[PDB]
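Obj: model holo form, ligand = NXL.
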Amino acid sequence: DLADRFAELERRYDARLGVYVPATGTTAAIEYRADERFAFCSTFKAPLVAAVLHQNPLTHLDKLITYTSDDIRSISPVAQQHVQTGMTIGQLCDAAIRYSDGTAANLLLADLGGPGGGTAAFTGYLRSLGDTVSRLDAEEPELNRDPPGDERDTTTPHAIALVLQQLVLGNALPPDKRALLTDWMARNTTGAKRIRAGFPADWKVIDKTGTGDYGRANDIAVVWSPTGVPYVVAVMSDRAGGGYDAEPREALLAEAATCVAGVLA
Ligand SMILES: *C(=O)N1C[C@H](NOS(=O)(=O)O)CC[C@H]1C(N)=O
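Output (holo structure tokens):
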């Protein structure tokens, strides 16, 4: 039984674990704490980019965005460099997904616009996809810091997996926008030790990671079998037992994915 295996992992890492894989043709949904809330962390950045793509003509990608020193207030491996030149929307999407740049994310939030620096429009984008559970309330760095249990800035394995399914595999976006999102996620640089480590090499994996305080570590993926059958995999965890400075534990997500890969194979 999968639930027995997920529970052992929780004991091993002193963690809380959530897992969701929607049903397909022939496979039942895999669910474990799938409706408990977990911090989004950097994982909102995948549907944030979709929201931005959806809202604008493709050539909006070429629009140059300028920003300064006081706009850098979280891990931002790409944006820290180009504060002189500015960055285009396309570059910002690229960094937000592949590098989980937080400044890219804040700037895309502002591009989307409206109250909460764009956090209301982000959340309404999710509503339009039938997700009535997720909420974004703060931008970077504040969104990774809410105490354990607190509903702000949370989604559920169940909710984000249905979002991601619509985004990459359904018709939420037109195909040309769909392919852009899909390809940034394919080229992600931060997930090697997460869902990716759980599936064999001949499976395609695309993903968006997240990491936060209280030992938070997440990964949302779409994976394709060697014969091209897709599944959506959402893994979320935290370790409230360590307190604010608990270490996230990637190996936890890689072990849970392997458990899921052995079922799906
Ligand atoms: C996202 O969750 N974050 C932004 C940045 N990169 O995401 S990743 O850790 O999953 O690769 C650093 C960690 C985190 C954050 N604390 O903002």
